[PDB]
Amino acid sequence: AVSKVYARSVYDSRGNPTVEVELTTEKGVFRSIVPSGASTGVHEALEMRDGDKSKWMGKGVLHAVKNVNDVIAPAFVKANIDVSDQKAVDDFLISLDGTANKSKLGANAILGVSLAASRAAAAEKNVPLYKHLADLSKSKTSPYVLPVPFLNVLNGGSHAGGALALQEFMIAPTGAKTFAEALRIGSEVYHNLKSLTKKRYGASAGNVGDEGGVAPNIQTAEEALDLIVDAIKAAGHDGKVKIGLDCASSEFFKDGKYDLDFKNPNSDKSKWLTGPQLADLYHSLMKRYPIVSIEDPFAEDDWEAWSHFFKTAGIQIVADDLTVTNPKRIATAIEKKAADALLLKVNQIGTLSESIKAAQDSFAAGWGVMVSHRSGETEDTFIADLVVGLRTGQIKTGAPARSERLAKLNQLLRIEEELGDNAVFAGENFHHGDKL
Amino acid sequence: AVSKVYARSVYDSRGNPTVEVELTTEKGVFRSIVPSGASTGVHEALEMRDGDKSKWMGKGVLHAVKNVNDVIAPAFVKANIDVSDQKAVDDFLISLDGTANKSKLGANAILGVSLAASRAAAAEKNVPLYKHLADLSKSKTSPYVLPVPFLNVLNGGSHAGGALALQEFMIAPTGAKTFAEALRIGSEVYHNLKSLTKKRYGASAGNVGDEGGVAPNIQTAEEALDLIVDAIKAAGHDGKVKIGLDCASSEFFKDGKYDLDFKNPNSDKSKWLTGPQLADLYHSLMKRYPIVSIEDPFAEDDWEAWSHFFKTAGIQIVADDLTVTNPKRIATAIEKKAADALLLKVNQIGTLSESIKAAQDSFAAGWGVMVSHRSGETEDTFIADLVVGLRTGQIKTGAPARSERLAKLNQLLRIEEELGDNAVFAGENFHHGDKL
Ligand SMILES: [Mn+2]
Ligand SMILES: [Mn+2]
Ligand SMILES: [Mn+2]
Ligand SMILES: [Mn+2]
Helix, strand or coil: CCCEEEEEEEECCCCCEEEEEEEEECCEEEEEECCCCCCCCCCCCCCCCCCCCCCHHHCCCCCHHHHHHHHHHHHHHHHCCCCCCHHHHHHHHHHHHCCCCCCCCCHHHHHHHHHHHHHHHHHHHCCCHHHHHHHHHCCCCCCEEECEEEEEEEECCCCCCCCCCCCEEEEECCCCCCHHHHHHHHHHHHHHHHHHHHHHCCHHHHCECCCCCECCCCCCHHHHHHHHHHHHHHHCCCCCCEEEEECCHHHHEECCEECCCCCCCCCCCCCCECHHHHHHHHHHHHHHCCEEEEECCCCCCCHHHHHHHHCCCCCEEEECCCCCCCHHHHHHHHHCCCCCEEEECHHHCCCHHHHHHHHHHHHHCCCEEEEECCCCCCCCCHHHHHHHHHCCCEEECCCCCCHHHHHHHHHHHHHHHHHHHHEEECCCCCCCHHHC | CCCEEEEEEEECCCCCEEEEEEEEECCEEEEEECCCCCCCCCCCCCCCCCCCCCCHHHCCCCCHHHHHHHHHHHHHHHHCCCCCCHHHHHHHHHHHHCCCCCCCCCHHHHHHHHHHHHHHHHHHHCCCHHHHHHHHHCCCCCCEEECEEEEEEEECCCCCCCCCCCCEEEEECCCCCCHHHHHHHHHHHHHHHHHHHHHHCCHHHHCECCCCCECCCCCCHHHHHHHHHHHHHHHCCCCCCEEEEECCHHHHEECCEECCCCCCCCCCCCCCECHHHHHHHHHHHHHHCCEEEEECCCCCCCHHHHHHHHCCCCCEEEECCCCCCCHHHHHHHHHCCCCCEEEECHHHCCCHHHHHHHHHHHHHCCCEEEEECCCCCCCCCHHHHHHHHHCCCEEECCCCCCHHHHHHHHHHHHHHHHHHHHEEECCCCCCCHHHC
16 A cells, blocks of 8 residues: 655766655555666657756756655555556556656656556565566566676767767677676676777776766777777677667768768768668678667668668667657557667656557567666666566666666676576577567 | 575676675565775785686686685574674674685675675664664764765876876865755766866766766866866855865885876986975965865875874875775874874775774774775665764765766765754764764
């Protein structure tokens, strides 16, 4: 029986405020901290920030904390909602807000109460959290699937200062036989990556971006993929570790063309490339490197380049800014056959039922779901139980560095050991880990 | 009644393995993750690592996890120790090890069980953790003291690539009236610091070191302190925020001289300085900047430079590598009047009673105690309850970035709000927050 929903302001991996909600019931206090940070797409639940420039640079969430305390709680206490019924909870929160992108109370005020309730529901059913989330989404639980972690090792977009235009370079130990082995293989690769990084670029290049990867002054994509294969080669794991790229292409789409060299801004124009010319640079890279996932190859509204590259891509194609975890953008994405995996960011839709709901429609269309983090994360490991309950087989939770990252890798370590014989590692079936 | 002490290997802020111990009692499972990373001094409890170069670069702690599971637990279960009696616990762990620097079972195997037991003791007494730790050390609890956080904002030692030889540049909002205000003031300063950092040095300079600060290619100390006062000036908080330096001078002591320019290594020698010449460069800096704490001004065994600078320093002088949280090095440090504050790192002595014990002898000599983090931290917030139970008034827990950092700032937010009127903020009495 919820007796108190309360909220406070706390900080995120970037020293920026975020909302922390603790919900009380006859079994204790359950908490949740809302992730934050953006690259962000236009059709997503909206986050409420103070805007006062003389306090936290205008990013406090004091308001968002007021909506929780002042609006949601007294209302939520009086409803007498069964937290076990997550839809009841979320429908209640949506009802109270009444906008389509949650701009009334704020997607941060809403999410925090929506996730705290799922923890409380599990406390109460007496099953570990990943087990409830498995109940809520109706996933096989025979056995559970531990995911391949796509680890960010190197960054290059608006996030690094050389000419490199692709944003994230990720490694995936799909070759491993257990989660624990994938994580170990993954950090030996990373650690080597840093050493080579500091010899070649200088000690300055060893510093890390927000997600834990390094951001050396690299000039070409090839130049970056080569540093990662040397890093995989030196760690002694050639053939067991794969790559994944997040090109964040919306970033360099201009005039119907893609500028592989922005950051100028003496923008050479004639080297700019059409969907199809870029489609030829990705096939190049695909043949020379062990690339198995490409996230956002084309821009958020460039549907025909998506549909035309996917007809022959033969690899996993992820949509992040093209679908903004919006079930209405997912569905077009699906009728146009524009990709085959969705990046799910629960705070992009703002509620747990709506999240679980998107993965489900992505699954029924033959798609995969890479559960993912945000730029500004917290010590909350909610997404570890979530890639385990949805049984997706793959998770992007940063590099094996900065603990807002490792707080989730560590939780997958504990779940794996906990499940004993009841867990299989996705491995190479990362794509459809749900169908295993 | 402890019924099971068990351990597993988990990862640390740096992607390097560390020991996680969970202890069971009639009230649940209590856990602790051991911090790690070094700069490290010679007379301290020793950490046990595998040494196998084909696994985690030779840094696993599989062994350390075996000593816990295989040696400590079956022994610890059979003893039937009252966890409320922390000395009984720790004396038991010391007894089982029998070396002076814990090299028998490993200071990581020992610490993790020693801290998990204090959580369990508090569960059982039914008081929040900081309240127990206050019981164990006998500190006034009328009211409690929230600490001034020394935040790392800029790094320059073996940790950055320019000529700068001092290691840590820290800001301290002592001017604030609450903890929450100090943390906010602290992140607005930091965030400005990053902006100026990226204009002046390039986007590459915005990447962060291990503790969350930035490491720009800076050349002089002055050059660095000026960037921090411009950062304090722009954030709108001149006069409320102070500085602190960690010179890690052991790093550049060579032939009885200090090389302010190592990193050469065409080491100009003649510019090298004696204790007293360096004592004159710190007084310089002290008059031009709002410096209020200097950590390790001279090297770990250079006692006469310490004693001679402290007779006229007039600011807080912290010993980290000179005392290695060793009560026997503290005491000499005290008879020689070499400093006045101790950096306490619980894993440097390896047990909670021995830690609490060192702060106590530092306190009785008129000293202050800056409770501190390690280079490789985890999502464990144990040190937040500890600066609150010892009532020291000051804590070094990294910059307001990377959540292994913010996991502890966030916990001080929650304790502060929890204590209501029962907490005062150290502010400007950070030095002797214990005597307030
Ligand atoms: Mn983001
Ligand atoms: Mn993306
Ligand atoms: Mn260290
Ligand atoms: Mn130091």
